[PDB]
Amino acid sequence: TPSALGKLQDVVNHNAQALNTLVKQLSSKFGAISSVLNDILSRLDPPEAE
Amino acid sequence: NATTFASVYAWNRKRISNCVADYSVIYNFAPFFAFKCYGVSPTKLNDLCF
Ligand SMILES: *[C@@H]1O[C@H](CO)[C@@H](O)[C@H](O)[C@H]1NC(C)=O
């Protein structure tokens, strides 16, 4: 019978999805020119990259 | 160093590719009236890769 152990599967899937969302939000540029700090520090001056 | 430039309504469009972008040769010309850089720093252009 399927979905018999769905309770623990839901917990592990929620944990995996939370981790995936947390690691995906890293690539989201929140109004900045880029999502990589190395692409901003090596391109803009400190007073403008800050 | 072009002799004849195009008008503002029909501005020219040259594409730079497959070459070493040494921006130090730009400063060799006459003093510029405006050297505003947006999204990039005029000092670290020689270290970037476009
Ligand atoms: C720009 O062109 C003129 C005319 O050919 C030349 O005399 C001058 O040396 C050039 N400037 C540079 C920086 O190459």
UniProtKB/Swiss-Prot annotation, chain B:
UniProt superkingdom: Viruses
Glycosylation sites per record: N1
Subunit structure: Binds to host ACE2. RBD also interacts with the N-linked glycan on 'Asn-90' of ACE2. Cleavage of S generates a polybasic C-terminal sequence on S1 that binds to host Neuropilin-1 (NRP1) and Neuropilin-2 (NRP2) receptors. Interacts with host integrin alpha-5/beta-1 (ITGA5:ITGB1) and with ACE2 in complex with integrin alpha-5/beta-1 (ITGA5:ITGB1). May interact via cytoplasmic c-terminus with M protein. May interact (via N-terminus) with host bilirubin and biliverdin, thereby preventing antibody binding to the SARS-CoV-2 spike NTD via an allosteric mechanism.
Role according to the record: Attaches the virion to the cell membrane by interacting with host receptor, initiating the infection. The major receptor is host ACE2. When S2/S2' has been cleaved, binding to the receptor triggers direct fusion at the cell membrane. When S2/S2' has not been cleaved, binding to the receptor results in internalization of the virus by endocytosis using host TFRC and GRM2 and leading to fusion of the virion membrane with the host endosomal membrane. Alternatively, may use NRP1/NRP2 and integrin as entry receptors.
Protein name: Spike protein S1
Organism: Severe acute respiratory syndrome coronavirus 2 (2019-nCoV)
Source organism phylogeny: Viruses, Riboviria, Orthornavirae, Pisuviricota, Pisoniviricetes
Coverage span on the entire protein: 343 to 392 of 1273
